[PDB]
Amino acid sequence: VHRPDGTYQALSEVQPIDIFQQKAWRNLRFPLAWAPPEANVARIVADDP
Amino acid sequence: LQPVPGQRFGEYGPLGGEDPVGFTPNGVSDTLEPAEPVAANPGTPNSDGP
C-alpha cells in the first residue's frame, strides 16, 4: 500500500502462475484476486542463488 | 505500469532500486531453447512423422 505520505509498507509476496515449462519468453501471471484489497503498488523481487 | 515518481532508481532503469547484484540489462541469452523436446506419442491422427 502507498500511504498518503510516501511510506510504502510491503505486504505478502506471491509466486507466479505459469502454463508450460520452457526457456523462451512467456507471460507470468499474478491474479489481482490474490492481493489484499489495499494493494496500490507492486514490485518484482527476483533473485537466483 | 509507471513507477511512483519519487524514488531512488540508480544507474540504469527503475528495475533495480538499490545495488542490483549481477542483473545487467543485456543479460538475456540469445538461444532460448527448451532443454527437452516434446517426443509426440505414436498414433496422433494428424502427424506425418514416421
Automatic annotation (TrEMBL), chain B:
Q: Where in the cell is it found?
A: Cell membrane
Superkingdom of this protein's organism: Bacteria
Family per similarity comment: Belongs to the emb family.
So what does this one do? Arabinosyl transferase responsible for the polymerization of arabinose into the arabinan of arabinogalactan.
The name on file for this protein is Probable arabinosyltransferase B
Q: Which organism is it from?
A: Mycolicibacterium smegmatis (strain ATCC 700084 / mc(2)155) (Mycobacterium smegmatis)
Which part of the full protein is shown?
735 to 784 of 1080
